[PDB]
Design a protein around this ligand. Structure first.
Ligand SMILES: [Mg+2]
Ligand SMILES: [Mg+2]
Ligand SMILES: [Mg+2]
Ligand SMILES: [Mg+2]
Lengths: 362, 362, 362, 362
């Protein structure tokens, strides 16, 4: 999550004083508001940037005089993010988008005066808008529901956000939380900032726990759906083999090595393809080929050589009808679908092969 | 599990003809019964051995005239296992055990006439007896209960074992299943042998599924008991570091590499200790040290260098107060308590670090 | 080289007593002579074998009454090598060879009565005879010259071999040195055996020194014939690259890693293909591909990806016109022509890349 | 080598026109002369820098009004190197040195008016002067002799340098070659620059060839000085070992793996410490420990474990009396002294172990 501190004050010294305490509290972004860009020049964003190079500075240009030139004036003064309005012409948005690409600067677009905010949000994602800014309305939070469920890019929210209302906007999927007077008008703006970051870590702990249990739920399904042909086909091939070669691609290769390390303890004549001591593949040897897609070129080339040498091939893959699957004598189908398809495949194979070891040890 | 075919026939030519069909069905051991060692000589054991060199031949010498001379004659004729009685004197048991030790031959001892079957099995385990043979009694299976719960060595069972009664003795923990007339006196002895092996694989499928869910249940516990101080300490150290070095011992090292591969995709300046491209540890770098015991010498030595260079150390360990834990600035405790202590730590850390990656990608 | 002790004594108890002292001195083979296989039976070969299982026992059957029956009796009594005559019929030679093949036993054939010793040895090599035995003649050693220069299999020598005449037969290429009374009829047969082994190591020291200088002489030739276009092409590509990827096959890969370790110390953005931390190949990156043949499939496949990504490829190979060479933008040709073709390329490249490092450090 | 183009013209447009052609010819450094820094301001170095960011710009401040302030004025305008006089006060030199450290800028010091140029050069190296500038005098080149042989930092030379005199100053060890009118007053300044760089590559080819032969000369000395105790001690230990473990540190570890790969082809039971399949070190195993210094902590710890397990240790080291040497049963002393001591040790071990392989193959 990202905490953006809106410095809506007209006092330049009061604004920098607040940002310094908020920065110690853990705030990520600092917004130079429109009341600060009219009195002070564009150097207002440069004063904040040269003082806080570790933070991203957001230039609030949510006024109608803003064109592609004012957006470039922000980037040259050190603005990392520039905010504009959605009611502006599409021509000015793409012109601001091209200027942003020349400087590596993000673009935020507000929907404060948009009739159909939902429809407008989708086309903004098409041109390359980085963030969408919506307001809470403190039917409050109704807008945050639909715009978030409509687009994939991060959505920023603002409007009466305090330690009381911030947990709500997080539950609805807001990425950027813009808070103003709740920090700027407090006795300890740094202390209030830490409580907001503590709320962020309440969500982070839920994310990691949910990520862990989402993987373990998938692995329980793999275990419940294992077939006798697959398990026995692998075990009988391992026992009847002269040498055992294991070959996996990328992270699958680390899983293969972790399995080989255990097989060595059971006095199997096992080797890892690609390491120093790997001997020549001969007749009667077994190749355990691990590839989630079943199309990895190096894994397929190794399986083809093993068949030509008069050996057996066991393919661990998610696609039994893949090129690797059609070569194998035994196909162990591990499904791959929080976590990507590859991560589920690698971790499921990891614990499946540990189940294989437990079986051999009994 | 082990399938032992009892050849109680007195015809030697019929015994080898039937043993050949049972061997094709997947039988592991072949027993030359006492009615075969009295009509035929000790050459009955040598004829079976030279015919089935890949099979283990069991010489049934379960009579009371058996001494060290008859036991030594079996090993010299090619018997891999010799079965004797438990009611014999302890002197003859160690004399048969010492004779067996001279040939690398196992010794099976039956408890058919033992008063207290539980006690006798345990003291047999003390002298070094390899296997204990008990009978079903077809209160049937009561003995199989207590002998299994009393010793750690494999327990052999025999007595009215067919396709209906074999599943029960497997459920009670018998390792060696001795089947006679159910195979030897059947119209298709090879088909019955395959069906008995199919019964073995019904238990194997239960073992591997139970092995997998035992690991995932422990990881769910790890997720529920993760601490915010530890998780945030690791993440904040990772974000605030110049270079990130990851170093694990053995199988833990493969887990560390799997985490490093993902961190590289997230544009971290990450390296794996021990690989070719690893640069020098400087001030502001972070060492993530992974060691279940927290006492691995190489991992501890790397943590000491990292501290002397003015760097941070995060220890992922099962022992927070270990030598590695006491050096670390942040300790991520992966709790402990079918699978060994090392396997649970490695698999829990693997899925925990995948939860960390899921958090960083949000 | 092999030291064979001829036990031509008729006393069996004296033969084993002397063979025990020769074995402690380091003798490899023990020959039970014909005067021992006629007075004593074929059990002379079994008594020696069960006494020296780590030694190879040679059964001297060099008489003309020897047929397939006597040769088979030696293998069944534990003879590892059987010596017969070259003047026998070819039918009995292949019959002894086929009998030997059934036991995994070698066959030695003497040429004591052969008309044309050169021709007979070569046709013996065609049938699969393992060793050729010739006699010194103490024009002595003339036969040892021609038989050695005629066949590829080891040549055994015998005839007046003591500490003065053994160095000469070694210089002429004899592999098996058969010594009799110089050991068996001496005051210290164990000491004489150690002195004969010391003679073997005088030749070994010459072999290893000659092996090393053969490699360094080839590398001096590589240095003298290096081309400015190749060397500068590699250096200029290295300096002008964003990332440098190094990829070698097998032992060439270890050489590539050794070069990568040094380049990292020179502040190059260098990575090794196949290791954990290797990132994605982008535009402006360089692939240094090392392959002696220029046909290694994985190396060729990596060069093709590097070209499709808009990168440069430098191929270090022995074949400029190979598949890898034709893909490369720069080809560094490491020339070819005791050491195999692979060893010369790997060691020449290793020292060439160390010359490159010395240049860069200046 | 470095080619520095002195732009001594007073015309700013003529100076930038010359530097653009010289840059295409391969010139490394561009010097903004004093006749350019008096007419134009310090922006003269900024105009060259913003036009040639790929080149290092040298600010010629060899006048007496130069203090620490003028040196800082050059760095803020983009000067990568600043040149001053040696006849200035030592106070101004260290003040310029401290300013250079704040900006990462090099300092060049001329000896045009120094009485004893040799003596003055040494103390300049003590304070941290990066380069020493001397003049040819076209007894010309006499100054270049003594100043180069007195200091270790790079020495820059200037004065009548043309395609005729440049080969001479290179032979005397000049690092930076400053050429003016020979390029600036030619019909093709880019073409003349390429001929100077071609002269540089005539020296580079000599450097790499000399580096290669310096290594091979050292290896021939190692071969000539090998001892029977070392070679036989290693070979007898390898043959009499159950398992063979190889463990080297850093680049020595790659040499160890290259040797292990060859030993595997000879059917040795050989393993590499640190890889996946490495089994447990048991009684009767051999550890080949490779460490140039004989003090590498991980190598010493592995040798100590091997001795406690009842195994043998062979140490390949340059220091027989090191900690590793005192542990070993056999010490193979490889000397380590163009190339560092480690490079000579690693490459000598590399070809020695290839001599060992050739010996075993005979
Ligand atoms: Mg705002
Ligand atoms: Mg029975
Ligand atoms: Mg002879
Ligand atoms: Mg000058």
């Amino acid at each position: 999550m990202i905490l953006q501190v809106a410095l809506d004050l007209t006092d330049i010294e009061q604004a920098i004083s607040i940002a310094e305490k908020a920065a110690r509290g853990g705030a990520h972004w600092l917004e130079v508001g429109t009341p600060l860009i009219k009195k002070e020049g564009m150097r207002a964003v440069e004063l904040l940037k040269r003082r806080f190079p570790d933070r991203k500075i957001v230039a609030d240009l949510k006024t109608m005089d803003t064109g592609a030139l004012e957006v470039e004036m922000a980037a040259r003064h050190g603005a990392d993010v520039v905010s504009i309005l959605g009611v502006a012409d599409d021509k000015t948005i793409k012109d601001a988008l091209a200027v942003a690409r020349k400087y590596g600067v993000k673009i935020m677009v507000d929907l404060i005066g948009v009739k159909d905010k939902v429809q407008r949000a989708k086309e903004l994602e098409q041109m390359g808008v980085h963030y969408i800014l919506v307001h809470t309305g403190i039917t409050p939070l109704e807008d945050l529901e639909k715009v978030v469920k409509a687009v994939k890019i991060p959505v920023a929210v603002a409007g009466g956000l305090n330690l009381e209302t911030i947990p709500k906007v997080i539950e609805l999927g807001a990425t950027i939380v813009i808070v103003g007077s709740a920090i700027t008008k407090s006795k300890d703006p740094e202390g209030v900032t830490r409580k907001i970051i503590d709320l962020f870590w309440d969500e982070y702990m839920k994310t990691i726990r949910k990520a862990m249990k989402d993987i373990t739920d998938h692995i329980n399904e793999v275990a419940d759906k294992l077939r006798l042909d697959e398990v026995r086909g692998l075990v009988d091939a391992m026992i009847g083999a002269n040498k055992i070669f294991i070959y996996g691609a990328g992270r699958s290769g680390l899983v293969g090595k972790a399995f080989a390390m255990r097989l060595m303890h059971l006095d199997f004549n096992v080797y890892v393809v690609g390491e120093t001591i790997t001997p020549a593949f001969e007749e009667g040897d077994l190749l355990i080929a691990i590839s989630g897609s079943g199309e990895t070129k190096t894994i397929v080339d190794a399986a083809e050589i093993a068949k030509q040498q008069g050996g057996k091939v066991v393919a661990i893959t998610s696609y039994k009808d893949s090129t690797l699957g059609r070569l194998a004598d035994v196909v162990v189908e591990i499904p791959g679908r929080t976590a990507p398809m590859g991560t589920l495949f690698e971790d499921s194979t990891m614990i499946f092969l540990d189940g294989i070891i437990a079986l051999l040890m009994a």
